[PDB]
Amino acid sequence: ARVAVLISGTGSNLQALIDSTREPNSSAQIDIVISNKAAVAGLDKAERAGIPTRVINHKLYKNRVEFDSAIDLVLEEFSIDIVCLAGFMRILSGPFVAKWNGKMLNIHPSLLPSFKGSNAHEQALETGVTVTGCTVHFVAEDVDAGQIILQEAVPVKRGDTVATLSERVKLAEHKIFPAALQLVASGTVQLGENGKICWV
């Protein structure tokens, strides 16, 4: 299966996906990295690995639909089968999500359904949980609500901040995002006709 990874920043999840997809038994190959922001570190990581990059600046488009449309064009150009959102910080439009239904994955730094949205660690620290974690899920139109593929729990330590907790949680993100990608690329897991997760 041919994969596009979309990023907005550092790219530690991208790097973990690059490392796993180059293992001999990997059922996924990463063919293109797309950033919505110029000059971010994930673009360097992609180039060092010999993977084509594109920047598609959301700020240059009238609305979400046109922006997603420009992404979809790249996706078709590289004949992509699966899309991974890896630190990608934009909400995607309905029809784009419908088109890639069953074929687009996201990593989110909480145990969904808790702490949806773009500041999950701040919410987790404000609420005072002692266990948080991360989630890989299929992308549905409703944000951070698609079908869950894998999760991993991570302790919150007393005195944690967003810096120290996100560092601990990323260590677990870097394990389940490659595992989930391999599950979907191999056809072991798919989005079922009834809309629930199906293990084959």
Ligand SMILES: Nc1nc2[nH]c(CCNc3ccc(C(=O)N[C@@H](CCC(=O)O)C(=O)O)cc3)cc2c(=O)[nH]1
């Ligand atoms: N339809 C859909 N899109 C999705 N995108 C993602 C990607 C990862 N999750 C996100 C959840 C919420 C946001 C969010 O507040 N964004 C703001 C930009 C924030 C800013 O810089 O000011 C926006 O864009 O205005 C972003 C990403 C998942 C995800 C999903 O599950 N469904």
Ligand SMILES: NCC(=O)N[C@@H]1O[C@H](COP(=O)([O-])[O-])[C@@H](O)[C@H]1O
């Ligand atoms: N709403 C999605 C979200 O919060 N994504 C989070 O952004 C970070 C990106 O790091 P990276 O650029 O080093 O992979 C990761 O922790 C990811 O789970």
